[PDB]
Each structure stands twice: as C-alpha cells, then as structure tokens.
Symmetry: C4
C-alpha cells in the first residue's frame, strides 16, 4: 500500500537506527574499557569489565532498537533492514525481485549514515578506540570459522522471521519483540567469535566509516559478512518452506 | 473519559515513578562503585564494575518502570510522562493544545518529587556521589554532541510511540513493554554520551534536587535536554505522519 | 472455580518458587563474590563483580520466576504469592476477606520451604555467606529509609497489578510478564537500599531459615517488610480506585 | 498435521539451536575470562568478570534461542527440544508414547551436532577451556544436591509449559517467550550449582563432544541430568493435572 519511495525511506531509517544504536553500544563498551587490562588476547575489551554481561548488553542494544524499528516501520516497508533478510524472503517468493536492489541500496545507505552520525555524537574515539562496532573475526578465529558462525547465526534469525513474521499462522503483534530478542541472543553467543553481524549492511556502514575516519581497512573480511548471512538466510527460508510444505 | 484533574495526577505519579526508579538506579550504581579505580576518564563509575552491563541495567530500571507505568496509567492519562512526547503528539494533532501545559507542569512536579523522595530513601550520598542520576554531557562530549544524541535518541522513542501506541493499526497490549524496552536500549547506547534523558522532566527533577541538596549547578546544560528531546520528538512525529500519509 | 484447598496449594508452590529462585540468586551472587575486595562499605558483595548488572540479574531471577508462576498458577489461585498483594486486593473488595488468612498462611509456609530447599541444594554457605537472600537495610540506611523504600516499591508493584491484572480493560495475557519485569526493575533500583522485598512472605522465609541455620537474627527488621509493603499496596489500590472512579 | 519425519527434523534443529547458542555462550564466557583470578573456588570463571550478570547473560542466550525456536518450530513439532518435556507430556497423555523415542533420538542427535558445530566455529578452546558448556556439579556441590537442583528447576520449567503451552486456556502467542525467559531465570539461579541443565539432551551433546575433543569424561554425572529433569518434569505435569482437575 505504501509507495516504494516511502518504503525505501523507511528501510533507510530502520537500518540507520540498527547501526547507530547497536554498533554504537559496542563502540561505547570499548571506550569505557579503554586502558583496562584483559586476562587474555581473546578478550579485546568487550567483556573486560562486564564479562558476558557486556555481550548481552550489546546484544540488547541491537535487539531493542530492532524491535522498536519493526513496530514503527513494519507496517510501512516490512522493516527488513538487512540485505540477507530481503534476499531470504525473495528466495521463497515472499518479496518481489524488482524491489530487492532498491531495498538493499536503502539499507546500505542507512547503515553508512547511522555509523557516521553516531561518530559525530560520540567523538573520534568511537572509531579509533571503538572501531564503530565493526564486525571482524576475533583473535584466533579464522576466515572460515567466522563464516560458519555467520551462517548459523543468520539461519536462526531467518527461520525465526519465517515463523513469526512471514507465516500466516504467526501470533499477531509478537514479530518485533521476538526478532529483536533473537538477535540479542545470537550476538551474546557469537559476538566474540565473528562480531555476529548477520547483516551485510550492518557491517558495511562501520567498515566504510572506519576506513574514512579511523584509517582502518577491514574490507578483506567483508565477504564473510556478505556470503555468510545470505547463505544462512536462504538455507533457513528453504528449510522452513520444506518443513511446512 | 477521565477528568483532566485525575489525568494530571496520573502524569505526576507516572513521572515520579520514572525518575525515582530510573534516575535512582544510576545514583545507586555510582554509590556502589564509589572508591573504585576507573581505566580512563570517559568511565566515570557507571561501567566500572559491570561494564556496559551497568548501562543496560540502568536502562532497564527505566524501561521496566516505564512499562509498568504505561500499563497502570495508560488507560487513564495516556501516560506521556515526558514533555517531549506531549509536544510531539500535539504537533501532529494527537493531543489538544489546551492540555499541553497542564500535563507538562504535572510531569515537572512529579519528576521533582520523585527525585526528592528517592534522596530521602537512599541518603544524601545519592546526590553527593550519585548526582541523583542527573543527565549531563560525559567527559570529552561537547554541548552540540550531547544535543545531537538527544535528538536521535528521542527520535527513536517518538517514532516507536507513533507506531505502537498512536497508530490505529498497532497490536493491542504491546505499547507499554515496547516503549519501555526501547528506552532501555537507547540508554544503553547513549547513556555514556549525554546521559540519554530523552525527557525534559526527567532531567529537571534531578537538576533541581542536585542544586538544593548537592550544591551542584547543572542548569547551564538544561537547554540540551529541552531542545534536543523536543526537536527529536517533533521530527519523528512529522516523519511518521509523512510515511503513513 | 478451583477449591480453596487447591488454590492454597498453588499459593504455597508459587511462593516457594519466588523465594527459591529469587532469594536464591542473591545468595549465589554473594557466594561467587566471597573473598573479593569491595570499593566501599555500601557495596556488600552484590555488585562487586557485576556492578548494577548483579542487581538486575537478581531482579530478573525474581521477575522471570514470578512471570512463570503467574502463567502457571494465575488461572488457579490468582497467583498472589505475596501477603501485601492479597491484602491490597482485599482493601478494594477484589478478594474475599474470608480467604485472606488462608492465602497468607500458604504463602508464609511456601516461602519458608522454598528457602529451606534452596539451602539443601546450594549448601550451608547459601546461608552463612549468602544469608539466603534475606532482605535488610543496607549500610548507612536507617529503619525509616528502608520503610519508605518498601512503601514506594510496593506501591509501583500494586498499582501495576491493578492496571494489568485486576482492571477489566487490561490486555489479556500480559499480566504475568509485566508484573514480573516490574519487580525486576524495582529490585534493580531498591535492592541496595532495603533489599527490595515488597513481600512479607518473601522476607519471612529467609529470616526463618537464617535464624535456624545461620544463627542470624534479623527479626528486629521484620516490621519494615510487613508494614512497608502492606501500606504501599493498600495506598496503590486505593489510588487506582480513585483515578478510575 | 506435519509428518513425523519433518517433526523429528524440527526437533533436531531446535535442539541443535538450543545447544549451539546456549551452551556456546557458557563456553565463550570461560574463554574470555581465562587467565583471570577468581575470589574463591566456587567461582570457576563464570561470574569472574560479570558476577551474576554472567549467569543471566548465559541464561538469556539459552532463553532467547529457546523462544526463537518455539516461534519457528512450535507449529511444526511442538518444539519440545528436551527429552524431559517429551516424557512429561507423555505422562499426562498429552503426547503419544509411540513418538517418544523418535523425538528423544532426534533431540540427542541435534544436541550432539549443535555442540560439534559450535566447536568448529569457536575453536578447540571452546572445549579445552570452556568445556563446551557441559553441565556438572560445581565445587562443593554433591551428587544429590545437584540432583535436587535439577528436579526443582525442571519442575518450574514443566509446570510453566503446562500452564502457557498445554492448557487450552493459555493466552495465545505467549508460550515461546515465557518458556524461554523462565529457563533464563532458572539458569541464573541454578547455573552455579548444577549447571542448570533441565534437559538430558542439552547435557548429552556437550558431554559427547567434550569426551571426543577435550578428553574430558563427565559421564559419571550424567544420571543427575537424566533422572533429575525427568522426575521434576513428571512431578510438575502430575501436579498441574491435579490442581486443574
């Protein structure tokens, strides 16, 4: 019912929110932990002061912002705010192919602006110390291990979306909060492994701004956050379709 | 249906609750962390013992109290308990202008009393050490950076309120919990930047009591917490109206 | 519809659950923090390792157990599991006076057994080190300050119960989770002040077992946890009745 | 309506998710805390950096994954993902005996694969340092104390399932989130006592992989996690049936 123009604006706003608040909380954690001594290399600062509590806090900053976005924009654009979700829905004929690129562009732009505006609010340290919450393999984690993490994590996210937001039998009203909390849980577990992106746009924004303002080049890892989420999402969509066929 | 007198009493109670429990949790955090050594100046004590866990805990003390208030008073006054929300609703003709001042006065009074009564329960240290949870720019954060944070934070709060509480299509029953959790998430991210007020009354109460009992004068920062939230709220209300027009 | 005998058994089980899981989490926190160095006297161990994160964790152990109990027993006994709630409902003619004593006795017994069984699971240290999560004024907090805290805290709890569980306009299904989360929020704020009991039975259980197994006599503080909660609950019930009259 | 083959696949996926994300978060906590100094023997690393905050974080990693699974698979297989739940339902004629073994086998297999795949993502340290989140009595806790903990914990889980998912009067849509949060709360309290398994399969997976990849033999404790959960679940199912008879 809503025009594609307005729906793309909604996707831009939703992804802006996702990155500003979610990735922002991770940058803040590193900023307030800066100067502290970590027990081992695997602990880079997130978890130094609050242990796994730091990870569930970041997970919830993402989760509550995602839930808020879905309740505010779900009835407008569907609030995908994730290229992997858009592609996942498309793979099972739940979203028109003609609108896939428009949505993804809006999401990438929203993520980039969200990261940029957060940097303006928090200061340069959000990038030089916090890395603007950019997702990258943690110490000792290989390219393929991070890839596997993103596939499994996005699989859970997408299969949940299929059951609570796509399925006609889904209980009305619960989609936003369940999807957000599911993301919070996935980040709590996978955050210290791959950064738990589950979203190509959510990784794109911080990567772009880190490059421009922190002189940090993480693009060599970007394929992990493109292939991993997309593969996990499509696999989940196809699996759900099979189980309910 | 409920008289303006009773609705104003409800707004007073709701804002009293918001400040007593929310701002109170921040004061308590500083009180139990007093004497500890922080890794750097940006970390003022909140996050010293629990990292970002401290921030999501404060965010939830606010969030759960807000949710409770909305379920208890929503059907009475609408439970705005925030001058920026009242003005935001007014800007899109969702609340009568003739009741704006009455509601705001009730909110300011409730916030002041909530802070005062908390001070009586917790002791003078809640103000001298905890600053009664007053919101102010954190170390290294400028006036305009804090302003930008309040605009973005209140924008998310208000657009969520529009979608889940104002919109006729909103799923019934979810407003209270979603609004509260959204605030918890915003505080988790922005707490260590501007204090994440999102509410002129929530800042007014602690400021007044800090001045009277802690000899702390933060009024020079008050414009941040008046202009920021109001601008963000109106911008969100107008944006929602546009997207759904 | 359910007999008083079965409803009393339900109240016993519900209060047993409330104390076993809620008060138990507080004892565990102190047990895992034992031996650590606190920054100041106000911090007794809860918050030493996780800051306010420790308090919201205890609050949620209580909150999730309360929500679970309400969804499991609400349709049976009404799941009051709190003498102050039973009395509050009675004060506004929402519960028969003839069943007040039966419910309270069941609640007191359930709390005592819950604390006892937890002690058996966790070991003697749950009492000698953790104090079985007994509520008492914290360092520097006077008898009247703790009393005021219990009144305000129980006021919020009861007014929320009136709006989401008692009121005929309340959205169905939300009562359990909202009541539980409200308690979690109140404990997060007031835990380090009065222990945030809000419940005469929840205090009775640990007090009894601490006396028998820890040789700790806290009965001199019990009036705080009887008068405070009851006054707050009745005041809230009467206030709600007035606002909606 | 869904074939047993597809329902068993769903149970496999659901239990895989439960173990990968839940048990995985516990392993991660130990990995990021490795090298730190604990205040006492009872604190093995979980709680070292975040106190009880670490436990509620692990509890929520389990809880959010469980909620997600129920919303995604509940309408397919019923999403038991726990042998004790399957047996509990069977004991009160709410699940056919002919499908009990098929479901349990699927659950055991899913748990084993979930643990294995997590090990691949996180690295060998997830097992050698994190023990893949295997549940075992904590320091000072005897075999019978851990057994009692599992009985009480699973009793709460099952009685909640009866009231919110089995009972025809249960409010629609709430089952997934309430069951998940209930588990989070139980783990917060009992995690540092018995590991708070409440699930024979959730313990089986980590035990198997720890044996194969960590050379750790915990099978001598397995009876605790088989008998405890099953006894608690059946006792709860029978109790609910009695109270509502």
């Amino acid at each position: 019912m809503v025009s594609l123009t307005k729906r793309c604006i909604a996707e831009f706003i939703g992804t802006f929110i996702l990155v500003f608040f979610g990735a922002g909380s991770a940058a803040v954690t590193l900023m307030i932990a800066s100067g502290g001594t970590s027990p081992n290399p695997f602990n880079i600062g997130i978890g130094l002061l609050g242990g796994l509590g730091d990870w569930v806090a970041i997970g919830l900053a993402f989760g509550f912002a995602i839930a808020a976005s879905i309740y505010a924009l779900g009835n407008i654009s569907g609030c995908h705010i994730n290229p992997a979700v858009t592609i996942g829905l498309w793979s099972v004929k739940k979203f028109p192919g003609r609108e896939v690129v428009p949505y993804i562009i809006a999401q990438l732009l929203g993520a980039a602006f969200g990261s940029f505006i957060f940097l303006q609010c928090a200061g340069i340290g959000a990038a030089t110390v916090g890395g603007l919450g950019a997702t990258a393999p943690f110490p000792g984690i290989s390219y393929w291990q991070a890839m596997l993490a993103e596939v499994v994590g996005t699989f859970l996210l997408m299969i949940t979306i299929m059951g609570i937001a796509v399925d006609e039998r889904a209980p009305k009203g619960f989609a936003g909060i369940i999807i957000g909390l599911t993301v919070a849980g996935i980040i709590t577990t996978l955050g210290n492994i791959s950064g738990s992106s589950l979203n190509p746009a959510r990784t794109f924004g911080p990567y772009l701004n880190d490059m421009i303002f922190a002189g940090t080049d993480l693009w060599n890892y970007y394929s992990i956050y493109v292939i991993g989420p997309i593969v996990g999402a499509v696999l989940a969509a196809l699996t759900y379709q099979y189980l309910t066929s």
